[PDB]
Amino acid sequence: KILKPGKVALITRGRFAGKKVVILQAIDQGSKSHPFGHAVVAGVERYPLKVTKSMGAKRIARRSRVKPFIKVVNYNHLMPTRYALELDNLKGLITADTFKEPTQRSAARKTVKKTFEEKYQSGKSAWFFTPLRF
Amino acid sequence: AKKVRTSTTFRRPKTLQLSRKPKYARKSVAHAPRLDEYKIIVNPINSESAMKKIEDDNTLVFHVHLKANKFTIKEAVRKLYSVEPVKINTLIRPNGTKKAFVKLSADADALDVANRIGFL
């Protein structure tokens, strides 16, 4: 039960390898479409760049923009992590129906993008928004 | 203000390198172009194989200078006979002279051009 909705984890397989994600909702039982212990996650595809005392608000905002992704990932391809990230905006928005409905997939991706904007700007989960150097 | 060295190496500083401004030119008169078209094209070839290339391949065969290359032969032919070649092949003969096969365009008739030169 270390993989719960709201736990931060790392992806080790696939295109988004080495990226930090938050478990949106766990399907540990499995599904007909995914006959394994998969879990939908939202992660940061492009981490925001570092900022400084200098640079105008334009450059700071330009470097603070974040590109997210949403993906169904196997448990064996996820690496769990002790840090936990939670927000009520990202509870229950994702499901199988969202993945089949591509407009909902894009809408959920944009909602995850926005939610990461306020979270980064507010300075929460600085580790989650820091890229991992491997 | 003591200058900070961060390399532990001293590398020779860059100083102004003036360009040459001679008080006199070493040569009074510049030489003329040593390889002009009249020296590039020596003679045409009128042997039986040369005629065969003229009447079928649309190709003119010339005795040319040793220092002449494909580019200079094309410019020399263009300026000396007003016909632009499409292809040039060169070989050094066993007698030490260079021979150039000059394939003319379909716009030009190698038979006619050979006639104007006079060796046909």
């Binding site: 603070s64 | 900070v4 390399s7 190496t9 001293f10």
Partner: peptide
């Protein structure tokens, strides 16, 4: 006081982060 700044200090001990550019004037091969 933007929280995005953070410190990120560098430690220049033996085996730690790369040594900073120092004055080496007393070691230069003159």
């Amino acid at each position: 006081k933007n929280p995005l700044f953070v410190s990120r200090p560098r430690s220049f001990g033996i085996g730690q982060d790369i040594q900073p550019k120092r004055d080496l004037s007393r070691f230069v091969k003159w």
